[PDB]
Structure 1
Amino acid sequence: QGCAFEGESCNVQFYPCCPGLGLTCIPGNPDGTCYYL
């Protein structure tokens, strides 16, 4: 139901990383942590 910021848990179905911020969801399989590149 939203998007995640750096350092926050992500899930590619429910809570992808918020865009425009360099964030990748690692590992994102489907869960990860939003990491800055």
Structure 2
Amino acid sequence: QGCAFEGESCNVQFYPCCPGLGLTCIPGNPDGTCYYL
């Protein structure tokens, strides 16, 4: 797996979130959480 799904943590340094569906990393500096917008 490359990108993270909703509910887990995502690192904007090596492991980003899965785009296309509408997910974002919060805070994402450097670690974040994948949530739906």
TM normalised by structure 2 equals: 0.85
Identity of aligned residues (%): 100
Structure 1: gaps (5+ residues)? none
Match of 2:33 in 1: 33
Structure 2: gaps (5+ residues)? none
Per-residue deviation at 1:21?
1.5
Per-residue deviation at 1:19?
1.0
TM normalised by structure 1 equals: 0.85
Report how many aligned residue pairs link the two structures. Answer: 37
Per-residue deviation at 1:31?
0.2
- The ranges of structure 1 where at least 4 consecutive aligned residues each deviate by more than 6 angstroms after the TM superposition are none
